[PDB]
Design a protein around this ligand. Structure first.
Ligand code: NAI
Ligand code: NAI
Ligand code: NAI
Ligand code: NAI
Lengths: 331, 331, 331, 331
């Protein structure tokens, strides 16, 4: 008989059932960055890719497969049909439309909603116990959308949120202080993007409040202008885009970090977008970034950060804005 | 005084001298894939990126920097001037020109050679003891070019060669056999691309010659058509391009593998392009892929693979072709 | 002291206040053609350029500056912030979005309206007494939009309209007759583009009605097929695009003509888009091209052209169509 | 009979013979900028355009024709056949190849030479008494090439040379001093581009030597670093390109200035490239920029500028380099 059968004796006619499977939807810049990061942190035994452009999809899948010798993720598959995603522990959404200059924030959101109206029901059909990690912008809204469409409990629907923002913050802090960002601690909360809130009260190195050493920290009479740090966290993503076209690497790594906490059940604390109704004064179904304990069941627990009146108010306003957009949305 | 001076007491006014530094020249798809691969295998304490397009360059540098919290590479720099590459242990060249409407292999090659005539001397100026790892196509020729321009000894000029090709081969073999490519062993040597030679004699799983189990292996009377594997190895790179535009991921992972072997002085054996004159019947200054022992000094040693006459002849002809191209090239 | 202070004695610490300032918004082909035309007719003492693409903007500004020796416009500035436009007598809008694969007239329009929702308020903030000259397509609609957003009186909001169309008409007539277009007189009114109306009644050379010499002029039984002239006026803009990519030169010269009439208070008569409600049977807030008297305050007066019923009706229908579009548009 | 014949009585069956005709070869960015500048300075009664891309050509020609009402140049024609250029007083060459990254300076020059080998003989056939104004880069070489191919006397072959460079210089001087460049005087000579020489000895405002007021002017111990001015004159064209893609406006205006001096026989002095053999120490057939008297017969006379040893030497070196390139060139 065949060379394979001459060389190999078979014990098991094998039920191929994935044990730690991850699916990425959208193989654009972000989606693929997430993919290579995940492959190189060995977070999955099966990686599935899904997109509507079949060329790009198959191409990216083959390019990865070819690097298999250098990886420890034994099944990489792709497809337009969602059966390829069956039994994922984790499904990351990076599919999205590109905002165009004229396009209202609203029109964009609605386009993306229609996209989600296609994706989420399919994902849920084939992996009804997965965690959803939403990356597509504008992310607090789309995480709400995904939650509405899936009918999943709030713990299994997570948005990438201010994870990345907080990483940029810590990087900038580190640059200012001559210390690695792993040792510079600081939190960015609320609405991802322009409206995010830097919590100065808890900025520290080695458990030393920077705010008590420098009481004017992050105010206007701040001679060292630390507000600039946060301003930069916001404008960075702009500059980077202007410069290179888009953001991929940093967000891919942030998402991989999150995935590591979930897949490995670590119970680390991350600033991610979660359904915050009831807390921080918020009284609508909106998603904002707070410090969340991530693990095998998604968001198990939430850190109640003490805020100033102004911080609480910034959040309230973000929530009112977000809600205003969300109620003009059809499911 | 400043918040920094109030928070941090300084012992050392520090000589910043990189200890394990890597430079990637060319931040296109390939270059950047190499970069993220290097960043995620913790192979470097400083990574420098160099390109002529300053926008793209700075953007990519920033996108990486923003992911610093999730990395263990504490300095990432970019620049148009080569002083940013000073003291690299390893410099990867991915820079190249894109072939255009009505451009002969020869014209494209000459343009790339002129590119190298600029890059290599600068590189050598600022890192005179580095190893050069050449990735740009056509790679055997361009590695020969780098070697000529740098005046480095043949051990410090390595070309990517058939590393990736051999990886694709092992992936395909693995697919045919239901085994991981790590355990399917097989070698592709000589000229990277179309003219490469699959050494069937040494195809094995667990030290079991496939060629002795299936003597017709890889011939034309081979009922299982194993030639197809090799054909595919060649056409893969085509299909992928056709599908997605280009190749990045696999080649990046291959290069990172090589880099690991060098930075860590492993003395693993890899099929790379080395100045092969004196061996295999070859009598011209050409580079071909053979099994090379890689370590802190680049190529320390070479494996002398037993070949058939036909194999030896394919090699001879590729070497004659390469020389034929090279002798029509001005330095 | 400095060479400057040694060479030059200063009388005045000078309030830099522009006296005849022009702003062009949008530095694409059209915008820049307008700019060189304005620079070479000596219509301005300060020219400001504004765009969202900062690279293109600064480059064009510098390329112009470098030609200063050959010009009599002593200050050329560019910028992304609208403070560089402060105190313009005249602001030309050429900014616009490009229509894409599967984009309705309506979607494109809405994108452009959103663009205007940003530009116009800024413009008005820094130059509250300027005249607005709108060039971006679809121009009658977009002039209506600028008028709505700015709250300027109808005399200060002028659209390019059928100025250029009428120029093409006169060129074609001139070709047919062997006379310069300066001496061939003829009017194209109403909706710029396909729906425009050629007023044959007033086609003349030296005050000689072509319509009375050739009563069948411009009808279907016209053996000389003068309709073709008008048809061509419409198809010209198509052919040119097909051939070269776009239109710049002619439109630029047209806009500069208009500008001359305004900056110099000439009170020449030009066919431009003006808020025509109350006249010609029109009963909606729409803009159409009629003969307008242009001068230092924009459109001071309007020529009441005698029309046939059919002409009046074409106008009525274009106005109803325009309104139909506008009522589906959000401010 | 016809409407034309009913309206117009003909005296003259007219020999159409152009009296002040200009031809532009190459309707790229530069060529068209030259064209619009010429049209707006009313330097021609007939303007002819020539290119190998027939679409682009016809398109640009129509776009100009359509602006005829606003111009005082009554015949604008285009074509691929050179009969359209017959009887030009002046033929401007802007045709050229784009230098590619890999491309040696030499390869580019040779490509352009082959282009000229097509253009010049045709131009000369149809306008044997014209002046040739060479703009294409590298311009001192191509002006030599045009002269060799045409067999015209040295007065009728002019290169754009350092006209533009000197305009940039005067603009920068003007910026530093708060004076219009028309009143800041200063000369840039020799090889256009990087190797150009700023003649500090004759830098002045109102006949006041800046070099005698500030003896260190343009040296290294110059505390005001005036060398930077010249450095910038060189890097400007680079920055502008980087920023916008290319240079058009400034060069178009420079060329139009030159054209004005020729067409109108003014005998102004301009820094243009002329066959400098015999002077400034140069002993080969090379072209460099010196101050030339331009008029109806092209370069009638030359200004003998007194130079330092170093300046003379810079020129000598430029000439030796240029010659070295030119003697490796086949006609
Ligand atoms: N929250 C965050 O921190 C960040 C979020 N993002 C977002 O990621 C998203 C995509 O970013 P990029 O990768 O740069 O875009 P990428 O544009 O280049 O492509 C997105 C992909 O989505 C796909 N897609 C569209 N409709 C689909 C459908 N119905 N089903 C499956 N796939 C579909 C496209 O085919 C495409 O491949 C955007 O929404 C962007 O804003 C980007 C950076 C950071
Ligand atoms: N050995 C292998 O198996 C493979 C080899 N390659 C080759 O590697 C090369 C890179 O491919 P891609 O990343 O897709 O191309 P990439 O084309 O998209 O761009 C190459 C980069 O090189 C840069 N560059 C050019 N000249 C430079 C200079 N003088 N100094 C600094 N930077 C310079 C460009 O700016 C560009 O960013 C190609 O030549 C390609 O054929 C590609 C895939 C696999
Ligand atoms: N009335 C007429 O006879 C004619 C009208 N037009 C119209 O004029 C417009 C310009 O055409 P082109 O110059 O070829 O287009 P151009 O497309 O090449 O680019 C338009 C410019 O507008 C800019 N822009 C867009 N949004 C902006 C903003 N929010 N702020 C500042 N700048 C912004 C872009 O950056 C771009 O540089 C088009 O809409 C076109 O249809 C064009 C030809 C003749
Ligand atoms: N000396 C100076 O001060 C300056 C010189 N230049 C030069 O002007 C030249 C063109 O510049 P651009 O307008 O930006 O290029 P443009 O590239 O966009 O196009 C040049 C034109 O030459 C044409 N052409 C090529 N072969 C031809 C032939 N055999 N017959 C007729 N036409 C032919 C092309 O079709 C094209 O339209 C280049 O050589 C450039 O270096 C540019 C700026 C300043």
């Amino acid at each position: 008989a065949t060379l394979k059968d001459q060389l190999i004796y078979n014990l098991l006619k094998e039920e191929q059932t994935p044990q730690n499977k991850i699916t990425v939807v959208g193989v654009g810049a972000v989606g693929m960055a997430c993919a290579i990061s995940i492959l190189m942190k060995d977070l999955a035994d099966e990686l599935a890719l899904v997109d509507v452009i079949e060329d790009k999809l198959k191409g990216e899948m083959m390019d990865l497969q070819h690097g298999s010798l250098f990886l420890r993720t034994p099944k990489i598959v792709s497809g337009k049909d969602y059966n390829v995603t069956a039994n994922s522990k984790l499904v990351i959404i990076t599919a999205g439309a590109r905002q165009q200059e004229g396009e209202s924030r609203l029109n964009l959101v609605q386009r993306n909603v229609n996209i989600f109206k296609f994706i989420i029901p399919n994902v849920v059909k084939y992996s009804p116990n997965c965690k959803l990690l939403i990356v597509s912008n504008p992310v607090d809204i789309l995480t709400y959308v995904a939650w509405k469409i899936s009918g999943f409990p709030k713990n299994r629907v997570i948005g990438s949120g201010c994870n990345l923002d907080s990483a940029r913050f810590r990087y900038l802090m580190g640059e200012r202080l001559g210390v690695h960002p792993l040792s510079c601690h600081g939190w960015v909360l609320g609405e991802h993007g322009d409206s995010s809130v830097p919590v100065w009260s808890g900025m520290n190195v080695a458990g030393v409040s920077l705010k008590t050493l420098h009481p004017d920290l992050g105010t206007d009479k701040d001679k060292e202008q630390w507000k600039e740090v946060h301003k930069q966290v916001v404008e960075s993503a702009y500059e980077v885009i202007k410069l290179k076209g888009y953001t991929s690497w940093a967000i891919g790594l942030s998402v991989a970090d999150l995935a590591e906490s979930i897949m490995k059940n670590l119970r680390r604390v991350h600033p991610v977008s979660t359904m915050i109704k009831g807390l921080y004064g918020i009284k609508d179904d909106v998603f904002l970034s707070v410090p969340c304990i991530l693990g095998q069941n998604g968001i198990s627990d939430l850190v109640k950060v003490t805020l100033t009146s102004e911080e609480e108010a910034r959040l309230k306003k973000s929530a009112d804005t977000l809600w205003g957009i969300q109620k003009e949305l059809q499911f």
